[PDB]
Amino acid sequence: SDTAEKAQAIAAARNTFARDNPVSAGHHERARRSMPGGNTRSILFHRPFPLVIAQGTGSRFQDVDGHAYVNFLGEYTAGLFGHSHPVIRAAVERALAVGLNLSTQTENEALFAEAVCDRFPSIDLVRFTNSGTEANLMALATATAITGRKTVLAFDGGYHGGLLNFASGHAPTNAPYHVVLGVYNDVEGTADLLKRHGHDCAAILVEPMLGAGGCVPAERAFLDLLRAEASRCGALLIFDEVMTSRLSGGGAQEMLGISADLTTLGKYIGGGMSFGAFGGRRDLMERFDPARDGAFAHAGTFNNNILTMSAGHAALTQIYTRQAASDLSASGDRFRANLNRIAVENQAPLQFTGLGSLGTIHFSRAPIRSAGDVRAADQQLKELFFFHMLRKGIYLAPRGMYALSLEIADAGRDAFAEALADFIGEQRALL
Amino acid sequence: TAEKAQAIAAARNTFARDNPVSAGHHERARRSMPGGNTRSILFHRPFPLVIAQGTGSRFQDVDGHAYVNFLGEYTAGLFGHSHPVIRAAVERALAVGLNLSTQTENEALFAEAVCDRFPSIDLVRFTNSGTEANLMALATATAITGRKTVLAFDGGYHGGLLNFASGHAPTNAPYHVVLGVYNDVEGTADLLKRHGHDCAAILVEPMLGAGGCVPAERAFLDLLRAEASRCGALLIFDEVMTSRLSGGGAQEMLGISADLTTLGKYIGGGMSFGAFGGRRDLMERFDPARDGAFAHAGTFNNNILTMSAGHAALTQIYTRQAASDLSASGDRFRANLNRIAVENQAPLQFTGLGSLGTIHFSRAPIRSAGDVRAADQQLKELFFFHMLRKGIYLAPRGMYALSLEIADAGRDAFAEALADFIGEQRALL
Ligand SMILES: *Cc1c(COP(=O)(O)O)cnc(C)c1O
Ligand SMILES: *Cc1c(COP(=O)(O)O)cnc(C)c1O
Ligand SMILES: O=C(O)CCC(=O)C(=O)O
Ligand SMILES: O=C(O)CCC(=O)C(=O)O
């Protein structure tokens, strides 16, 4: 629960942040004249104002006030290649040479689709979208249209895009699919919901690890229930792998040996360009074959844009190969283990949860298994941690999430670990 | 008729014979994408072209055939295939840095250009597509009003998940959509009488785009503006296509203001792009710092490429003057095409506004989706294949969208090809 002591510490941290970043402060007031709250991505806003960045190369960027940071946020998993990857740049140059807005299919989209199908074991066919939000919306459109049903089972804490946000339960702006919310990792509770709703469930939509919800891994028993019951009731199991796809060459599904009926993809796979994708079992995806009678339509001006097609193919085949995925996940696992080792050795009431190269801090000693556990953790200390890391020249998400890019090296990881130890020492009274 | 069907069979066969390399590509593409397809509109029978390369207004297919691109990415491809200013903006974006995970000045600069240009947009937010923009506009309307009913129009197209071009579709996002008839004052008035109490939004294009370049009549839009205000529904103008028609879109030309406006396609400089904006008090609901703030997320919303290319698109390339000039150019072009039709007593017309136009094989008034559908669809398909054989590429549905790279030579070629079609297909006309 909130204390005056922690609130005063946060005020001090915010005040120091404010005083040290007057140019950013000024830009926020300016931006408010053209965008609501000077904002166009809700997650980028935090009090007193967000940092405005001038320039970045590799793993580093500099704000408009001259401070340099190592970027541990990695564009919420999308920024896997850093700020200036030469192979990505080469792909962009290649795309420009091919030509922009060609108003037609090129070979590049087919090559990218083949790359996706090759490495993701449950994706027989794929279609590209302009975001993970579109990918998940299309997956639900597919499920409802195929099954003829209206009910969607999702989970509290789950995030499937701007129109499918359940991070704080139901939101009035969510697309009006008939969504029933379960508790993440709750086998008995979810079993009960499927007994009530299963016969009219078009889809079960779930991340194999809550991403925005707190890097909360799904337990095998939970995913086993979803797979078993989706098949039983005739619902399509949709694994939202927008974040988890990086965890191995074939994402979480390769790791688990569990196959979803449809899989959604996004973020890094398009090489840092606008990107989403939905794919899955052949017989389901074939409903979109435009030559079929009663074919489902899937539109989108920029679905096949040359930049995404080129950068994405390079991302999957030239940079983040299946082996590179295994390697980075192993690297992330060692990193996260070291962070937790530092916590345990200092008897700190904090932990890092996640998988592979993905992690989020939680100020709690309890097992983090559902949205409730994440919310029950100390949110004041979380904010205090964010500002501390900033002062140490380390940028991660305000919510305490990192997503290791391929540009993070020993020096970056060491600085992060040292800064964590410093936080534990300096904030001992509040811990 | 059977004669038109045999002519279509012959045209498809000639296209197939002309393009065996594209045919090869299609068979391979089918192994990884449904129907070898990732945008439904790009498929046509017997198979679509695969393009190898393009520069300016021209492109080349994989069989080596060259074409002038009159399609212009369904209005998004306003700058041609290799605009130097767009290229410069891309290079500048790369110099700033990709996936910086933070705001830069560039999004603010782009937002400022958008708000400056469009008279009813006080505040704006960027999305990754026009579909996302329209979904967010509907999200805004339903959440603010607490109402469920959305009035839209048969023939209306508002994105993949909001596609009413052929009435309701089972894949459409499950908003409670009631469909009216475009330009139908009496019928729409009746619907607003019945549904006005629970109407969250009226969603309408100032000209049906995908529906056939069918201009809205003043009386129709006046009805919508008055009734939206009366019943407390948000009037949403989908200007994804129409925004190009002047510096400030259709709303500037009409002197009618929608409560929310959605944008897309060309405004992002050819990069992934969408935007929703409108009245300040409505948009302020998305200020993340306000109590009970609505959330609008999206990883690539503020992506540096779109922010840079978009700012260049509005402030350097497609200025207010450029918009006026291109629309005047397009009006002259469309008039010339219709003149050619009239001179040859051809049962066809081109409908549209400014640099946007669509052929319809009918001389009846084209005022709604019904009129578009009642026109000869067989001749429409024959026209597409004919133009291809003449090295002119436009939409299979017979729509052109003039880019800034279209010049005298291209326009002259289009006109001659139309005249040739009329003469060669006189027996079917
Ligand atoms: C980021 C994310 C999305 C949304 O993708 P966008 O490109 O931001 O629309 C969906 N699902 C998950 C699990 C994500 O992490
Ligand atoms: C193209 C279009 C859209 C959709 O924009 P996308 O980027 O393809 O999702 C919406 N409305 C209209 C009028 C359009 O023309
Ligand atoms: O490219 C797409 O998929 C949609 C294009 C479009 O909006 C149109 O039909 O005009
Ligand atoms: O950047 C955005 O708006 C979405 C990113 C996201 O899904 C997240 O919160 O991790």
Domains within chain A, CATH numbers bracketed: 1-84+325-431 (3.90.1150.10), 85-324 (3.40.640.10)
Closest of A364, A271, A136, A4 to residue B173, by C-alpha: A136
DSSP-based three-state secondary structure for B187: helix
Strands B199-204 and B207-208: unpaired
CB B276 within 8 A of CB A173: no
Binding-site residue set of B:
39, 130-131, 265, 298-299, 397
The coordinates were experimentally obtained by: X-ray
Strands B356-360 and B349-353: antiparallel
**Residues B97, A300: C-beta atoms closer than 8 Å:** no
Strands A151-156 and B176-181: unpaired
CB B249 within 8 A of CB B207: no
Cis preceding-peptide flag for B20 (omega within 30 of 0): no
> Is there an atom of ligand 3 within 6 Å of B143 CB?
no
Cα distances (Å, whole numbers) of residue A411 to A70, A414, A425, B214: 10, 5, 21, 61
> Is there an atom of ligand 1 within 6 Å of A144 CB?
no
The string of DSSP letters for B232-271 reads: TPEEEEE-TTGGGGSTTHHHHHHT---SEEEEEGGGGTTS
Provide the terminal-to-terminal Cα distance of chain B, rounded to the nearest Å.
12
H or E element: which one contains A118? Answer: helix A107-119
DSSP-based three-state secondary structure for A53: strand
Cα distances (Å, whole numbers) of residue A70 to A324, A407, B94: 21, 10, 18
> Is there an atom of ligand 1 within 6 Å of A161 CB?
yes
H or E element: which one contains A228? Answer: helix A220-233
Amino acid at B63: D
User: What's the CA gap between A7 and B365, in Å, rounded?
Assistant: 68
Q: Which residue of A138, A150, A162 is in closest CB contact with B297?
A: A162
State which ligand 3 atom lies nearest to the alpha carbon of A300.
3
**Residues A78, B94: C-beta atoms closer than 8 Å:** no
Closest of B256, B250, B271 to residue B353, by C-alpha: B250
CA B293, chain centre distance (Å): 31
Q: Which residue of A51, A56, A104 is in closest CB contact with B49?
A: A104
| Resolution (Å units) | 1.9
Closest of A200, A137, A121 to residue A174, by C-alpha: A137
Q: Collect all residues with Cβ–Cβ distance below 8 Å to B281 and sequence separation of at least 6.
A: none
Amino acid at B231: C
H or E element: which one contains B2? Answer: helix B2-18
User: What's the CA gap between A212 and A196, in Å, rounded?
Assistant: 28
Residue A329 phi/psi, 5-degree rounding, is -65, -45
> Is there an atom of ligand 3 within 6 Å of A297 CB?
no
For chain A positions 349-408, those within 8 Å of chain B (CB to CB) are 395
Residue B158 phi/psi, 5-degree rounding, is -130, 20
Q: Which residue of B33, B139, B143 is in closest CB contact with A113?
A: B33
CB A251 within 8 A of CB A61: no
Angle CA A148–A150–A154, to nearest 5: 125
Cβ-count burial B144-175 (b if 16+ within 10 Å, e if not)? bbebebbbbbbbbbbbbbbbbbeeebebbbbb
Q: Quote the crossing angle between the two packed helices A187-197 and A220-233, to the nearest 10°.
A: 10
User: What's the CA gap between B199 and B141, in Å, rounded?
Assistant: 9
- With breaks defined as C to next N over 2.5 Å, after which residues does chain B break? none
Closest of B336, B376, B346, B344 to residue B360, by C-alpha: B376
Q: What are the start-end ranges of the H helices in B104-254?
A: 105-117, 130-145, 185-195, 218-231, 249-254
CB A328 within 8 A of CB A406: yes
How many CB atoms sit inside 10 A of residue A43's CB? 20
Burial category of B291 from C-beta neighbours within 10 Å (exposed 0-12, middle 13-18, buried 19 and up): exposed
Residues of chain A by 3-state class (helix, strand, coil), percent to 5: 45, 20, 35
User: What's the CA gap between B250 and B252, in Å, rounded?
Assistant: 5
Strands B66-69 and B392-393: parallel
How many CB atoms sit inside 10 A of residue A47's CB? 13
User: What's the CA gap between B52 and B74, in Å, rounded?
Assistant: 19
Instruction: Report the residue of chain B nearest A124, measured CA to CA.
Output: B32
Among A159, A163, A173, A216, which is best to mutate for testing ligand 1, by the most ligand atoms less than 8 A from CB? A159
Q: Collect all residues with Cβ–Cβ distance below 8 Å to A293 and sequence separation of at least 6.
A: none
CB B125 within 8 A of CB B136: yes
Token look-up 């946020």 returns A73
> Is there an atom of ligand 4 within 6 Å of A76 CB?
yes
How many CB atoms sit inside 10 A of residue A347's CB? 10
Amino acid at B103: Q
**Residues A302, B135: C-beta atoms closer than 8 Å:** no
CB A55 within 8 A of CB A62: yes
For chain B positions 177-196, those within 8 Å of chain A (CB to CB) are none
User: What's the CA gap between B118 and A421, in Å, rounded?
Assistant: 52
Radius of gyration of chain B measured on its C-alpha atoms:
22
A89 is in an annotated binding site: no
Q: Collect all residues with Cβ–Cβ distance below 8 Å to A38 and sequence separation of at least 6.
A: A27, A28, A29, A30, A31, A32, A45, A49, B108
Strands B260-264 and B274-278: antiparallel
Closest of A163, A327, A258 to residue B140, by C-alpha: A163
CA A230, chain centre distance (Å): 24
User: What's the CA gap between A401 and B12, in Å, rounded?
Assistant: 55
- DSSP structure class, residue B157: B
Query: What's the gap in Å between the CA of A170 and the closest CA on chain B?
Result: 12
DSSP-based three-state secondary structure for B73: helix
Instruction: Report the residue of chain B nearest A118, measured CA to CA.
Output: B32
Angle CA A84–A134–A96, to nearest 5: 40
Q: Collect all residues with Cβ–Cβ distance below 8 Å to B119 and sequence separation of at least 6.
A: B248, B251, B252, B257
Closest of A244, A245, A242 to residue A215, by C-alpha: A244
* Tokens matching residue A4: 């005056």
Query: What's the gap in Å between the CA of A346 and the closest CA on chain B?
Result: 31
* Tokens matching residue A46: 């935090």
